[PDB]
Amino acid sequence: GLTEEQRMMIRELMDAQMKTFDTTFSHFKNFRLPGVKWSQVRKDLKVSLQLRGEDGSVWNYKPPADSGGKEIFSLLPHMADMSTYMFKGIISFAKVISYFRDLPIEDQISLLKGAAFELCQLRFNTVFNAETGTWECGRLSYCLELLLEPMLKFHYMLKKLQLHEEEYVLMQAISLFSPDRPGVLQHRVVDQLQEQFAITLKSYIECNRPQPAHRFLFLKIMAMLTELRSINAQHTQRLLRIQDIHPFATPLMQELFGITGSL
Ligand SMILES: Cc1cc(C)c(S(=O)(=O)Nc2ccc3c(c2)nc(CCCCCCCNC(=O)C[C@]24C[C@H]5C[C@H](C[C@H](C5)C2)C4)n3Cc2ccccc2)c(C)c1
C-alpha cells in the first residue's frame, strides 16, 4: 500500500542490511579476551561472556568483583574489538545506500560520526534475547549478571514492540540521515531525506499493522529514536571519560568519536 518510490526505498535498505549485517558474526575473529575522577569511572562501568567453539567446546567467562582497581577495565579491549567490528558493518551499510552516497563526503563522514553508536545499538537490539538478558552474537554470547540504566531500558522496550526487519532498517536510516548533527553541510538535503524515511515508516506501519496494539506505533518508534539520541550523547561522554584514564579505543573508534591522537 506504499508508493513505488516507498517500496523501492525499503527494498534498498533491506538489501543494504542483508549485505552488511553479519547476523551470525562468522567473520568477527582475532579479537582480544580477558587475561588468565575514577569515582565517576567506577560509576560509569558486569557482563559475562561465552564462546562456543566450532568443535562443540565452550569457554565461559565470569567477571571479577569490583575491588577498587584495574579489573573493571579487563573486558574493554574485547568490547573495543566487537564495537569496531559492528562499526565496519555500519559504515558498509551506509556506503551501500544511494541516498547516502549521493551526499558530499564531508557530510557522509559527519553523519557516520554522528550516528554510528545509534545504528550499532539498533542492530544489537535484533540479537538481544530479552527473556535471558543476553546478546546472542553467533558463537559469542554476552549475558548480564537493573533497568535503571537508560541504554538497557531502551533495549527491553524496543524489543517489546516486536518490530519487522523493515522497521529496524527504516529506524537505522532515520538515525543515519539526521540533519541535526555536527558538521553536516547539506542540512536541508538530509532533512528532506530523513522526512522520506520517516513517512515511508509511517506508511509501512499503516499498511501492515492494522491491529489495535500497533496504534501509535510510528510515534512510539519516533520517540525511541529521540531517546536513543540523548543516550548516544551520554554514552559518547562515558567513553571519553574512560578513554581519558584508561586508553582502549581502537583507531576506528577514535576516528568515529573525535579522538585525534594528539594530547
Ligand atoms: C565505555 C564505552 C562506551 C561506548 C560508547 C562503547 S561503544 O559504543 O563503542 N560500544 C558498545 C557496544 C555494544 C554495546 C554498548 C556499547 N552498549 C551496549 C548496551 C548494553 C549494555 C547497557 C549498559 C549501559 C552502559 N554500561 C556501561 O558501563 C558501558 C559498557 C561499556 C563496554 C561495552 C558495553 C558492556 C560493558 C563494557 C559496559 C557497555 N551494548 C550492547 C552489548 C553489550 C555487551 C555485549 C554485547 C552487546 C564502548 C565499547 C565502551
Numbering used by the authors: 142 to 177, 198 to 206, 210 to 309, 318 to 435
Paper passage:
Indeed, the PXRLBD contains a large and versatile ligand-binding pocket (LBP), which enables it to bind a range of molecules with different structures and chemical properties, thereby fulfilling its biological functions. PXR is traditionally regarded as a xenobiotic receptor, and as such it regulates the transcription of metabolizing enzymes and drug transporters, thereby facilitating the removal of xenobiotics from the body. To overcome this problem, we designed a new PXRLBD-Thb-SRC-1 fusion construct that combines the advantage of having good stability and solubility during purification with the possibility of crystallizing the PXRLBD with or without SRC-1 thanks to the introduction of a thrombin cleavage site between the PXRLBD and SRC-1 parts.
In this context, we have also tested the hydrophobic tagging technology (HyT-technology), whereby proteins become unstable and are subsequently degraded by the proteasome following the addition of a hydrophobic group (for example adamantane) to their surface. Two new synthetic compounds, named JMV6995 and JMV7035, have been developed for this purpose. The difference between the two lies in the size and the chemical nature of the linker, with JMV7035 containing an additional PEG spacer. JMV6995 and JMV7035 were co-crystallized with the PXRLBD and were unambiguously positioned in the electron density of the resulting structures determined at 2.50 and 2.00 Å resolution, respectively. JMV6995 and JMV7035 mainly interact with the PXRLBD through van der Waals and hydrophobic contacts. Only one hydrogen bond is observed to the side chain of Ser247. In both cases, the mesityl sulfonamide group of the PXR agonist moiety is situated between helices H3 and H11, in close proximity to H12.
